[PDB]
Amino acid sequence: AMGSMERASLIQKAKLAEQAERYEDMAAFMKGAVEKGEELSCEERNLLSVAYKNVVGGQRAAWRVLSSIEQKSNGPEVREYREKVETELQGVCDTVLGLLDSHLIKEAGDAESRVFYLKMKGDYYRYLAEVATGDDKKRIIDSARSAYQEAMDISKKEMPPTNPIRLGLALNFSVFHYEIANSPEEAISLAKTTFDEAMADLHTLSEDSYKDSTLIMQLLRDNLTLWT
Amino acid sequence: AMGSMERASLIQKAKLAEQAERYEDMAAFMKGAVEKGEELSCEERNLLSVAYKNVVGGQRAAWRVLSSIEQKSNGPEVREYREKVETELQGVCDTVLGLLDSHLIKEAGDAESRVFYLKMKGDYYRYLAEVATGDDKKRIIDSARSAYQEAMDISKKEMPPTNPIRLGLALNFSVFHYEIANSPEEAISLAKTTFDEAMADLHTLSEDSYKDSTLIMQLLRDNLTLWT
Amino acid sequence: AGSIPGRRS
Amino acid sequence: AGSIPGRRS
Numbered sequence A, B: 001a002m003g004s005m006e007r008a009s010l011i012q013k014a015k016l017a018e019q020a021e022r023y024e025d026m027a028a029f030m031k032g033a034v035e036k037g038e039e040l041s042c043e044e045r046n047l048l049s050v051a052y053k054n055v056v057g058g059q060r061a062a063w064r065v066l067s068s069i070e071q072k073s074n075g076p077e078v079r080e081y082r083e084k085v086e087t088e089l090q091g092v093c094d095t096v097l098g099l100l101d102s103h104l105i106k107e108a109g110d111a112e113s114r115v116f117y118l119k120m121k122g123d124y125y126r127y128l129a130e131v132a133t134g135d136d137k138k139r140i141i142d143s144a145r146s147a148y149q150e151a152m153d154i155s156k157k158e159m160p161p162t163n164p165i166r167l168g169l170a171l172n173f174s175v176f177h178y179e180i181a182n183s184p185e186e187a188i189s190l191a192k193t194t195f196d197e198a199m200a201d202l203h204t205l206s207e208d209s210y211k212d213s214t215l216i217m218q219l220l221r222d223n224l225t226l227w228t
Numbered sequence C, D: 001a002g003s004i005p006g007r008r009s
């Protein structure tokens, strides 16, 4: 779709689409930018992630509304429309996963980029798992777990415990344990250890880095308060 | 697109899409329902209007963000992307206008339905006028004015001054005068006369009708406070 | 200047 | 339980 537009113009337009709250456009611009074949900078990776998180976030919210109505009802219309939204959501997750597999992850050698993309891979398999039913659920769950675990292993070797990507990875992997894997104790353990190890490293940070890390720490604490 | 789905199923799905905040889907379901060729009930007319007002409202908000960035900048990217959003917006307005012309207005004989559709026609020409430049602007402005004026003439003959559609028509025609036609004094006059004539008819209303009419009266007052 | 929001049935 | 909102650059 975007093959005739310059990479730099796609990135420029993704930033404008964010300002305009046009997240489907933003995601299509950033897909086009990935498909140019070059690696993404830190800022570009964040544009890609913001675009798709907004698109899939709206789909997930709609799927949950429809699934709730369908469960209460238990004609074909509610199920048919939940299925339509579900298929669209799955298609977006498959598109993101396909960008990561062709070829963002394999070309990502620095820890910052490789962890970022593996966290994305865990997230989009987790969104697939949210709507999956049965044994399909099992293999999809294991794919999320494996991506998050590889990201965790790299992050713990290569990043300080306050790094925001390391923190957000741990947060989202703890949500995976709590909400998807039926492992609330593993979720609580991971959130507590992550919080405590970040706290002990705050003294090393500038004022601005302190603000970035403490914001995500508060999200870990907010989950611990809900879970305990 | 929706030719194979039953009318009643399209209406059912439009209501689900509203609950899910899936307004593009809602608009496509209600377009499909209109294209079945039957007249719309009061509730169905409101579903059609809500769906398109949400779709075009998001487009207008994005167009204004982009137009503001473009004006401040005065490469081709901001203009190109504003043009893309503008063309999409125009296409949605043309789709709504085409439903009204084929064949909702001509089949609408009761005052309630005919006024409702003529107000819509004025609104969607007004949204076209917001993005139009030059003499195109003039004919588009006159098309909005003519639709609103015909709706006004019917409403004043056939509806009480507290009727919510009559009130919302007058509100939106006053915005047309203020924002599009460069006639602020006509806007203020219309809003004041509409408010005063509704106030004098409130005594005739039930508690629930009173609440419906006074809500729109407050919108007229809010504009008068901003304009005076 | 506000028109009818018109965005909720 | 909240994940990273992740919706604003």
Ligand SMILES: *Cc1ccc(S(=O)(=O)N2CCNC(=O)C2)cc1
Binding pocket: A046, A119, A164, A165, A167, A168, A169, A212, A216, D004, D006, D009
């Ligand atoms: C998954 C995730 C982790 C951290 C963040 S963030 O700290 O809000 N931030 C976004 C902007 N640029 C960054 O490097 C990190 C968001 C998502």
Ligand SMILES: *Cc1ccc(S(=O)(=O)N2CCNC(=O)C2)cc1
Binding pocket: B046, B119, B164, B165, B167, B168, B169, B212, B216, C004, C006, C009
């Ligand atoms: C254009 C317009 C006028 C009035 C309304 S409303 O009073 O909010 N209402 C919507 C629900 N059903 C109605 O008949 C009127 C909205 C838009």
Ligand SMILES: [Cl-]
Binding pocket: A039, A107, A108, A109, A110
């Ligand atoms: Cl590399």
Ligand SMILES: [Cl-]
Binding pocket: B039, B107, B108, B109, B110
């Ligand atoms: Cl008729």
